[PDB]
Amino acid sequence: SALGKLQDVVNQNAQALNTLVKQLSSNFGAISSVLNDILSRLDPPEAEV
Amino acid sequence: DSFVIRGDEVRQIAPGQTGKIADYNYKLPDDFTGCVIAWNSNNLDSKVG
């Protein structure tokens, strides 16, 4: 617990990157989080929306 | 563009929808700008038989 500042900086950056990667896998109100399945299941207007 | 169609298939003509008429005869574009105008022509365009 002496190198807390550098470890905290590294942990914050890693947490930000991991949060970004997890947030990539969010629906945001869409049918699915993957675009290929959305294209396969839906017609072009609804899939585009 | 003039095309004489069955009054039962105006629905396919509308942009983004598909159908027999729409996929094989006349297709509209997705970002189409214009007017889909129709008027029943029984007196002249239809003839007996």
Swiss-Prot record, chain A:
Mutating residue 40 to A: what's the consequence?
In strain: Alpha/B.1.1.7
Instruction: Name residues in a coiled coil.
Output: 7-49
> Quick one: effect of changing residue 12 to H?
In strain: Omicron/BA.1, Omicron/BA.2, Omicron/BA.2.12.1, Omicron/BA.2.75, Omicron/BA.4, Omicron/BA.5, Omicron/BQ.1.1, Omicron/XBB.1.5, Omicron/EG.5.1
Functional summary from the UniProt entry: Subunit of the fusion protein that is processed upon entry into the host cell. Mediates fusion of the virion and cellular membranes by functioning as a class I viral fusion protein. Contains a viral fusion peptide that is unmasked after S2 cleavage. This cleavage can occur at the cell membrane by host TMPRSS2 or during endocytosis by host CSTL. In either case, this triggers an extensive and irreversible conformational change that leads to fusion of the viral envelope with the cellular cytoplasmic membrane, releasing viral genomic RNA into the host cell cytoplasm.
Protein name, entry field:
Spike protein S2'
Report the source organism. Severe acute respiratory syndrome coronavirus 2
Q: Which residues of the full protein are shown?
A: 943 to 991 of 1273
